[PDB]
């Protein structure tokens, strides 16, 4: 019961990546502003599958 | 006059990758500039993910 985003990523790792890249996570998750999320940023390349 | 080499390059830095990330950071990356042969590699998302 430690997964997120309907994928294999744990809440810990997702939280750490989002905090490291967008300063997001201590005040609720949400899609970061586009200008903060460049081509090599985290969220853009995240792709859950099932 | 003085052959005091002003470029001290190590083999630990990855200057190529550094410039790759800088070009993404400061400006848009999608657009193509022919002069520097500036055209970032990319796959078709309907091929990477079916």
């Amino acid at each position: 019961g430690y997964n997120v985003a309907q994928c294999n990523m744990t809440k810990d790792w997702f939280l750490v990546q989002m905090l490291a890249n967008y300063n997001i996570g201590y005040q609720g998750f949400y899609i970061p502003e586009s200008y903060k999320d460049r081509m090599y940023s985290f969220f853009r390349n995240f792709q859950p599958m099932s | 006059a003085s052959q005091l080499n002003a470029v001290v390059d190590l083999q630990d830095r990855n200057t190529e990758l550094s410039y790759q990330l800088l070009l993404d950071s400061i400006g848009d990356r999608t657009r193509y500039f022919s002069m520097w042969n500036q055209a970032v590699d990319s796959y078709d998302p309907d091929v990477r993910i079916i």
Binding site: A20, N21, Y22, N23, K36 | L21, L22, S25
Partner: peptide
Amino acid sequence: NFASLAPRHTSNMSGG
């Protein structure tokens, strides 16, 4: 001092 020239009318890898 140099106003006669003016027209008249840091990034490290992270930092959010």
